[PDB]
Amino acid sequence: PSLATWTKSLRDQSLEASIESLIFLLKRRQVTGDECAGAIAQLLRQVVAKSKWHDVDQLLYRVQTAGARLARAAPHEPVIGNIVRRVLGLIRDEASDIASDAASDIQSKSMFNLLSVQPFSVHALRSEVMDGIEEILDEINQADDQIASFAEIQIHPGDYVLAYQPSKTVERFLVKAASKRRFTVILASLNPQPYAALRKKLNAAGVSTINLASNGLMAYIPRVNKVIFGAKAVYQNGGLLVDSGACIAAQAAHEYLKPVIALCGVYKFCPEDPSDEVSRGELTTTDYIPPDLVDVYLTNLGPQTRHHLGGIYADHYKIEDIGFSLQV
């Protein structure tokens, strides 16, 4: 019924009931975007905790199967797959004291041993994985603030900043910047007053706000200093998944030498190349921005260029967990 209600039935509901409730939320689309990322992490944590497995191989299978089901419910949401792969990667990492000693190792692996009083080895790994998943959850929750901590670096006094259909991440970024900078924000949407709350918050902070006519976006871009977008996803090639019409704004910015900045947390980094459907823009209307149109990827780790992306992907993903689509 609600994500909040779903969250606290989690620990005293059956695993299958929790998975099915979340599936229900995803399909009715009550749960959307980045709060979806956290929901996946919490459900996967419960899978690690409550499902039956004795070896990492069966733990990996469990997580992947549950992840596949969740992904299926909301195919439009690519962050779900990212969280699943991050959890799969975490499991492999921790899988690699009592285990090094032959005596204790043998004792721990036995289901009928006085250490199993589920063999000990399973329990120790289970505990460590659940902890790591909590960390992933904290990484997800803190991403917007971490991205916003670089705002003073990105925005300078007197800047004219064009924000195209700002998301929550962009809002937190602009509001934070307002605390340390005096500048102007231009809110433009090609899809047609809007963003009254955001504007009210910005104005109180000392930031001027401009509303642009739909027709004028192309005429007015030469004025602005920089263009900022929230990315729904990032791809290995440096392409982005964005709101519809963003690609047009990106090109205009590029045409007039205006830096294009994409706000994206690493959890939104998809370890694939963009599907042809995405390139077509077919993938709730989204557009695709090719890497040539993007100047900066601003992440929780800081601003990055396309050349920096390979390192980031390698740091967070395992080759075994990528290169295939989750499927039940």
Side-chain angles (χ1 to χ4, degrees), residues 54-76:
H54 273 228
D55 57 347
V56 304
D57 291 317
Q58 293 158 353
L59 180 55
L60 294 168
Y61 175 92
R62 286 306 184 190
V63 172
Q64 155 163 358
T65 307
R69 290 183 58 189
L70 298 169
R72 202 178 55 181
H76 52 287

PDB file of all heavy atoms in Angstrom, residues 54-76:
ATOM      1  N   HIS A  54      23.372 -22.375   1.389  1.00  0.00           N
ATOM      2  CA  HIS A  54      24.459 -22.833   2.244  1.00  0.00           C
ATOM      3  C   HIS A  54      25.819 -22.431   1.692  1.00  0.00           C
ATOM      4  O   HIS A  54      26.808 -22.411   2.416  1.00  0.00           O
ATOM      5  CB  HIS A  54      24.393 -24.344   2.460  1.00  0.00           C
ATOM      6  CG  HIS A  54      23.516 -24.755   3.600  1.00  0.00           C
ATOM      7  ND1 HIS A  54      23.916 -25.659   4.557  1.00  0.00           N
ATOM      8  CD2 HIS A  54      22.258 -24.387   3.936  1.00  0.00           C
ATOM      9  CE1 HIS A  54      22.942 -25.834   5.432  1.00  0.00           C
ATOM     10  NE2 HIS A  54      21.926 -25.072   5.078  1.00  0.00           N
ATOM     11  N   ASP A  55      25.859 -22.106   0.406  1.00  0.00           N
ATOM     12  CA  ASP A  55      27.099 -21.717  -0.250  1.00  0.00           C
ATOM     13  C   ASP A  55      26.903 -20.443  -1.059  1.00  0.00           C
ATOM     14  O   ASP A  55      25.792 -20.121  -1.462  1.00  0.00           O
ATOM     15  CB  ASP A  55      27.628 -22.846  -1.132  1.00  0.00           C
ATOM     16  CG  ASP A  55      26.626 -23.288  -2.161  1.00  0.00           C
ATOM     17  OD1 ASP A  55      25.452 -22.897  -2.042  1.00  0.00           O
ATOM     18  OD2 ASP A  55      27.006 -24.022  -3.091  1.00  0.00           O
ATOM     19  N   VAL A  56      27.990 -19.719  -1.286  1.00  0.00           N
ATOM     20  CA  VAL A  56      27.927 -18.440  -2.005  1.00  0.00           C
ATOM     21  C   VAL A  56      27.219 -18.586  -3.347  1.00  0.00           C
ATOM     22  O   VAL A  56      26.505 -17.686  -3.775  1.00  0.00           O
ATOM     23  CB  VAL A  56      29.328 -17.808  -2.207  1.00  0.00           C
ATOM     24  CG1 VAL A  56      30.013 -17.641  -0.867  1.00  0.00           C
ATOM     25  CG2 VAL A  56      30.193 -18.652  -3.143  1.00  0.00           C
ATOM     26  N   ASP A  57      27.389 -19.739  -3.983  1.00  0.00           N
ATOM     27  CA  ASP A  57      26.795 -20.001  -5.285  1.00  0.00           C
ATOM     28  C   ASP A  57      25.275 -19.983  -5.197  1.00  0.00           C
ATOM     29  O   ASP A  57      24.609 -19.469  -6.094  1.00  0.00           O
ATOM     30  CB  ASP A  57      27.293 -21.335  -5.829  1.00  0.00           C
ATOM     31  CG  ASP A  57      28.759 -21.289  -6.207  1.00  0.00           C
ATOM     32  OD1 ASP A  57      29.182 -20.287  -6.825  1.00  0.00           O
ATOM     33  OD2 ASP A  57      29.494 -22.239  -5.870  1.00  0.00           O
ATOM     34  N   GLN A  58      24.728 -20.523  -4.109  1.00  0.00           N
ATOM     35  CA  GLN A  58      23.282 -20.507  -3.929  1.00  0.00           C
ATOM     36  C   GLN A  58      22.801 -19.146  -3.427  1.00  0.00           C
ATOM     37  O   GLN A  58      21.673 -18.744  -3.699  1.00  0.00           O
ATOM     38  CB  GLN A  58      22.842 -21.594  -2.941  1.00  0.00           C
ATOM     39  CG  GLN A  58      23.043 -23.029  -3.400  1.00  0.00           C
ATOM     40  CD  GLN A  58      23.093 -24.001  -2.231  1.00  0.00           C
ATOM     41  OE1 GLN A  58      23.108 -23.587  -1.069  1.00  0.00           O
ATOM     42  NE2 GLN A  58      23.117 -25.296  -2.530  1.00  0.00           N
ATOM     43  N   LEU A  59      23.671 -18.419  -2.732  1.00  0.00           N
ATOM     44  CA  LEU A  59      23.352 -17.056  -2.321  1.00  0.00           C
ATOM     45  C   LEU A  59      23.275 -16.124  -3.523  1.00  0.00           C
ATOM     46  O   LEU A  59      22.374 -15.290  -3.617  1.00  0.00           O
ATOM     47  CB  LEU A  59      24.378 -16.530  -1.320  1.00  0.00           C
ATOM     48  CG  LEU A  59      24.105 -15.101  -0.833  1.00  0.00           C
ATOM     49  CD1 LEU A  59      22.690 -14.973  -0.252  1.00  0.00           C
ATOM     50  CD2 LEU A  59      25.147 -14.660   0.182  1.00  0.00           C
ATOM     51  N   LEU A  60      24.224 -16.282  -4.441  1.00  0.00           N
ATOM     52  CA  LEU A  60      24.253 -15.502  -5.674  1.00  0.00           C
ATOM     53  C   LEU A  60      23.025 -15.780  -6.525  1.00  0.00           C
ATOM     54  O   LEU A  60      22.445 -14.863  -7.113  1.00  0.00           O
ATOM     55  CB  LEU A  60      25.513 -15.819  -6.475  1.00  0.00           C
ATOM     56  CG  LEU A  60      26.856 -15.420  -5.875  1.00  0.00           C
ATOM     57  CD1 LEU A  60      27.961 -16.084  -6.665  1.00  0.00           C
ATOM     58  CD2 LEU A  60      27.016 -13.911  -5.900  1.00  0.00           C
ATOM     59  N   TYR A  61      22.639 -17.050  -6.587  1.00  0.00           N
ATOM     60  CA  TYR A  61      21.478 -17.453  -7.365  1.00  0.00           C
ATOM     61  C   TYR A  61      20.222 -16.822  -6.767  1.00  0.00           C
ATOM     62  O   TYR A  61      19.351 -16.347  -7.497  1.00  0.00           O
ATOM     63  CB  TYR A  61      21.346 -18.982  -7.420  1.00  0.00           C
ATOM     64  CG  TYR A  61      20.089 -19.451  -8.119  1.00  0.00           C
ATOM     65  CD1 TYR A  61      20.100 -19.731  -9.479  1.00  0.00           C
ATOM     66  CD2 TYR A  61      18.890 -19.597  -7.428  1.00  0.00           C
ATOM     67  CE1 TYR A  61      18.959 -20.145 -10.130  1.00  0.00           C
ATOM     68  CE2 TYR A  61      17.739 -20.008  -8.071  1.00  0.00           C
ATOM     69  CZ  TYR A  61      17.779 -20.285  -9.423  1.00  0.00           C
ATOM     70  OH  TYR A  61      16.638 -20.704 -10.070  1.00  0.00           O
ATOM     71  N   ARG A  62      20.137 -16.816  -5.437  1.00  0.00           N
ATOM     72  CA  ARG A  62      18.976 -16.265  -4.744  1.00  0.00           C
ATOM     73  C   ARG A  62      18.791 -14.785  -5.026  1.00  0.00           C
ATOM     74  O   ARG A  62      17.692 -14.336  -5.351  1.00  0.00           O
ATOM     75  CB  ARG A  62      19.102 -16.461  -3.232  1.00  0.00           C
ATOM     76  CG  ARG A  62      18.868 -17.873  -2.770  1.00  0.00           C
ATOM     77  CD  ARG A  62      17.542 -18.375  -3.275  1.00  0.00           C
ATOM     78  NE  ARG A  62      17.241 -19.705  -2.771  1.00  0.00           N
ATOM     79  CZ  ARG A  62      16.234 -20.443  -3.215  1.00  0.00           C
ATOM     80  NH1 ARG A  62      15.451 -19.965  -4.171  1.00  0.00           N
ATOM     81  NH2 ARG A  62      16.014 -21.649  -2.711  1.00  0.00           N
ATOM     82  N   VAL A  63      19.880 -14.037  -4.901  1.00  0.00           N
ATOM     83  CA  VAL A  63      19.861 -12.599  -5.121  1.00  0.00           C
ATOM     84  C   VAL A  63      19.538 -12.260  -6.569  1.00  0.00           C
ATOM     85  O   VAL A  63      18.754 -11.348  -6.849  1.00  0.00           O
ATOM     86  CB  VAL A  63      21.201 -11.962  -4.715  1.00  0.00           C
ATOM     87  CG1 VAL A  63      21.251 -10.501  -5.127  1.00  0.00           C
ATOM     88  CG2 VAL A  63      21.401 -12.102  -3.210  1.00  0.00           C
ATOM     89  N   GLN A  64      20.139 -13.004  -7.490  1.00  0.00           N
ATOM     90  CA  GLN A  64      19.928 -12.747  -8.904  1.00  0.00           C
ATOM     91  C   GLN A  64      18.488 -13.048  -9.314  1.00  0.00           C
ATOM     92  O   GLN A  64      17.885 -12.299 -10.083  1.00  0.00           O
ATOM     93  CB  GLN A  64      20.902 -13.563  -9.746  1.00  0.00           C
ATOM     94  CG  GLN A  64      20.389 -13.833 -11.139  1.00  0.00           C
ATOM     95  CD  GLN A  64      21.474 -14.273 -12.088  1.00  0.00           C
ATOM     96  OE1 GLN A  64      22.648 -14.357 -11.721  1.00  0.00           O
ATOM     97  NE2 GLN A  64      21.090 -14.538 -13.329  1.00  0.00           N
ATOM     98  N   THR A  65      17.939 -14.143  -8.796  1.00  0.00           N
ATOM     99  CA  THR A  65      16.560 -14.508  -9.088  1.00  0.00           C
ATOM    100  C   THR A  65      15.556 -13.483  -8.562  1.00  0.00           C
ATOM    101  O   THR A  65      14.610 -13.109  -9.263  1.00  0.00           O
ATOM    102  CB  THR A  65      16.209 -15.885  -8.504  1.00  0.00           C
ATOM    103  OG1 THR A  65      17.174 -16.848  -8.942  1.00  0.00           O
ATOM    104  CG2 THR A  65      14.834 -16.309  -8.969  1.00  0.00           C
ATOM    105  N   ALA A  66      15.749 -13.040  -7.322  1.00  0.00           N
ATOM    106  CA  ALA A  66      14.874 -12.028  -6.740  1.00  0.00           C
ATOM    107  C   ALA A  66      15.028 -10.708  -7.488  1.00  0.00           C
ATOM    108  O   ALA A  66      14.044 -10.016  -7.751  1.00  0.00           O
ATOM    109  CB  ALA A  66      15.166 -11.847  -5.263  1.00  0.00           C
ATOM    110  N   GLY A  67      16.270 -10.371  -7.829  1.00  0.00           N
ATOM    111  CA  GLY A  67      16.562  -9.152  -8.558  1.00  0.00           C
ATOM    112  C   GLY A  67      15.918  -9.152  -9.930  1.00  0.00           C
ATOM    113  O   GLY A  67      15.427  -8.124 -10.399  1.00  0.00           O
ATOM    114  N   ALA A  68      15.926 -10.314 -10.572  1.00  0.00           N
ATOM    115  CA  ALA A  68      15.346 -10.474 -11.900  1.00  0.00           C
ATOM    116  C   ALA A  68      13.842 -10.208 -11.886  1.00  0.00           C
ATOM    117  O   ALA A  68      13.301  -9.591 -12.805  1.00  0.00           O
ATOM    118  CB  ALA A  68      15.634 -11.865 -12.431  1.00  0.00           C
ATOM    119  N   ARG A  69      13.176 -10.699 -10.846  1.00  0.00           N
ATOM    120  CA  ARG A  69      11.734 -10.537 -10.673  1.00  0.00           C
ATOM    121  C   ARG A  69      11.355  -9.070 -10.485  1.00  0.00           C
ATOM    122  O   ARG A  69      10.393  -8.578 -11.075  1.00  0.00           O
ATOM    123  CB  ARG A  69      11.275 -11.348  -9.462  1.00  0.00           C
ATOM    124  CG  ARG A  69      11.338 -12.840  -9.669  1.00  0.00           C
ATOM    125  CD  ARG A  69      10.814 -13.615  -8.472  1.00  0.00           C
ATOM    126  NE  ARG A  69       9.440 -13.292  -8.108  1.00  0.00           N
ATOM    127  CZ  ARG A  69       8.855 -13.730  -6.997  1.00  0.00           C
ATOM    128  NH1 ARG A  69       9.533 -14.497  -6.153  1.00  0.00           N
ATOM    129  NH2 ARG A  69       7.597 -13.401  -6.725  1.00  0.00           N
ATOM    130  N   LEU A  70      12.119  -8.386  -9.644  1.00  0.00           N
ATOM    131  CA  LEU A  70      11.903  -6.977  -9.377  1.00  0.00           C
ATOM    132  C   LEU A  70      12.140  -6.156 -10.633  1.00  0.00           C
ATOM    133  O   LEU A  70      11.405  -5.227 -10.925  1.00  0.00           O
ATOM    134  CB  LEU A  70      12.824  -6.511  -8.259  1.00  0.00           C
ATOM    135  CG  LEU A  70      12.591  -7.200  -6.920  1.00  0.00           C
ATOM    136  CD1 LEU A  70      13.706  -6.887  -5.943  1.00  0.00           C
ATOM    137  CD2 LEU A  70      11.243  -6.807  -6.346  1.00  0.00           C
ATOM    138  N   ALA A  71      13.176  -6.511 -11.376  1.00  0.00           N
ATOM    139  CA  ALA A  71      13.515  -5.812 -12.601  1.00  0.00           C
ATOM    140  C   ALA A  71      12.399  -5.951 -13.615  1.00  0.00           C
ATOM    141  O   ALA A  71      12.077  -5.013 -14.332  1.00  0.00           O
ATOM    142  CB  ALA A  71      14.811  -6.352 -13.173  1.00  0.00           C
ATOM    143  N   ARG A  72      11.819  -7.141 -13.671  1.00  0.00           N
ATOM    144  CA  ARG A  72      10.739  -7.436 -14.599  1.00  0.00           C
ATOM    145  C   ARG A  72       9.503  -6.585 -14.331  1.00  0.00           C
ATOM    146  O   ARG A  72       8.835  -6.143 -15.258  1.00  0.00           O
ATOM    147  CB  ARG A  72      10.391  -8.922 -14.552  1.00  0.00           C
ATOM    148  CG  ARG A  72       9.683  -9.433 -15.793  1.00  0.00           C
ATOM    149  CD  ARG A  72       9.417 -10.925 -15.698  1.00  0.00           C
ATOM    150  NE  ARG A  72       8.671 -11.270 -14.492  1.00  0.00           N
ATOM    151  CZ  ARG A  72       8.329 -12.508 -14.157  1.00  0.00           C
ATOM    152  NH1 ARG A  72       8.667 -13.522 -14.939  1.00  0.00           N
ATOM    153  NH2 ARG A  72       7.652 -12.730 -13.040  1.00  0.00           N
ATOM    154  N   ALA A  73       9.200  -6.368 -13.058  1.00  0.00           N
ATOM    155  CA  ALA A  73       8.052  -5.575 -12.671  1.00  0.00           C
ATOM    156  C   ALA A  73       8.194  -4.156 -13.196  1.00  0.00           C
ATOM    157  O   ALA A  73       7.224  -3.563 -13.655  1.00  0.00           O
ATOM    158  CB  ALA A  73       7.901  -5.568 -11.163  1.00  0.00           C
ATOM    159  N   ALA A  74       9.403  -3.613 -13.129  1.00  0.00           N
ATOM    160  CA  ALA A  74       9.644  -2.256 -13.610  1.00  0.00           C
ATOM    161  C   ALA A  74      10.818  -2.218 -14.587  1.00  0.00           C
ATOM    162  O   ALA A  74      11.916  -1.791 -14.226  1.00  0.00           O
ATOM    163  CB  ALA A  74       9.892  -1.314 -12.435  1.00  0.00           C
ATOM    164  N   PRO A  75      10.590  -2.669 -15.830  1.00  0.00           N
ATOM    165  CA  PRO A  75      11.609  -2.701 -16.888  1.00  0.00           C
ATOM    166  C   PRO A  75      12.129  -1.314 -17.261  1.00  0.00           C
ATOM    167  O   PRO A  75      13.268  -1.181 -17.707  1.00  0.00           O
ATOM    168  CB  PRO A  75      10.865  -3.342 -18.063  1.00  0.00           C
ATOM    169  CG  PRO A  75       9.427  -3.010 -17.807  1.00  0.00           C
ATOM    170  CD  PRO A  75       9.289  -3.154 -16.323  1.00  0.00           C
ATOM    171  N   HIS A  76      11.289  -0.301 -17.088  1.00  0.00           N
ATOM    172  CA  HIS A  76      11.653   1.089 -17.361  1.00  0.00           C
ATOM    173  C   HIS A  76      12.720   1.637 -16.403  1.00  0.00           C
ATOM    174  O   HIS A  76      13.426   2.586 -16.740  1.00  0.00           O
ATOM    175  CB  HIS A  76      10.405   1.976 -17.314  1.00  0.00           C
ATOM    176  CG  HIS A  76       9.604   1.825 -16.060  1.00  0.00           C
ATOM    177  ND1 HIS A  76       8.833   0.714 -15.795  1.00  0.00           N
ATOM    178  CD2 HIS A  76       9.454   2.648 -14.993  1.00  0.00           C
ATOM    179  CE1 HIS A  76       8.246   0.855 -14.619  1.00  0.00           C
ATOM    180  NE2 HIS A  76       8.607   2.020 -14.112  1.00  0.00           N
TER     181      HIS A  76
END
